[PDB]
Design brief:
The structure is cut from a larger assembly and holds chains A (99 residues) and B (74 residues). Chain A is mostly beta strands. Chain A has helices spanning 20-24, 57-63, and strands at residues 8-13, 25-39, 43-45, 52-54, 71-83, 88-98. In chain A, the strands form two sheets. Chain A has a four-stranded antiparallel β-sheet with strand order 1-2-5-6. Chain A has a two-stranded antiparallel ribbon with strand order 3-4. In chain A, strand 3 and strand 4 form a beta hairpin. The radius of gyration of chain A is 21 Å and the shape is elongated. Chain B has 74 residues and is mainly α. Chain B contains four helices and no strands. The longest helix of chain B has 13 residues, at 13-25. The interface between A and B is medium-sized, with 13 and 15 residues. Chain B: This is M1249L. Chain B: It comes from African swine fever virus. Chain A: It comes from African swine fever virus. Chain A: Belongs to the RNA polymerase beta chain family.
């Protein structure tokens, strides 16, 4: 679902004009997909500043916690600018995995 | 800092499992602690580190109590 049904290709109007290129630019096209999706086992933090440890379901039941596992996403963003001359500039960035 | 650690670990079912294993092995008293001193001693034996020591480093599961019986399984 994440890798196939959630591809983004949206073009937004340029809102800044305090530069020659800024007046040249009238739209930027944001385009990104997701490449890696993985859900881990439920984790928890003890120290509030320590390593995440396994959260057992009884602890989640007692503390009112959620037996939920982290979702890690890796994405690839393609940004395309458009100008009033028929050319386009592409800035391609790869997002590292994040929760 | 220690209060949150104590309430998070004392209600961890892993702590109860390690505590009952230690009680079977005799490393801790068979009764629940009645004084803060023996509660701290149980925490030291079950977790393997003092609550102050735990807040220093990051490793938690490496020093959890292990059985002294050495139960040859095969």
């Amino acid at each position: 679902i994440v890798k196939q049904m959630f591809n983004v290709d949206i073009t937004y109007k340029d809102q800044r004009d305090h530069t020659e290129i800024d007046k040249l630019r009238e739209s930027v096209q944001i385009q990104f997909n997701f490449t890696d999706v993985n859900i881990e086992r439920p984790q928890h933090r003890n120290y509030s500043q320590g390593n995440k440890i396994n959260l057992l379901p009884n602890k989640a039941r007692l503390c009112g916690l959620s037996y939920s596992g982290p979702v890690n996403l890796a994405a690839e963003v393609i940004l395309t600018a458009h100008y009033s001359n028929g050319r386009q500039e592409v800035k391609r960035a790869s997002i590292p995995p994040f929760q | 800092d220690t209060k949150v650690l104590l309430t998070e670990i004392l209600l961890d079912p892993m702590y109860d499992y390690a505590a009952t294993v230690a009680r079977i092995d005799g490393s801790i008293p068979m009764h629940k602690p009645r004084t803060p001193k023996e509660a701290e001693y149980e925490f030291k034996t079950v977790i393997g580190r003092t609550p102050a020591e735990l807040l220093s480093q990051k490793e938690f599961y490496d020093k959890i109590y292990t059985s002294k019986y050495r139960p040859d399984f095969t």
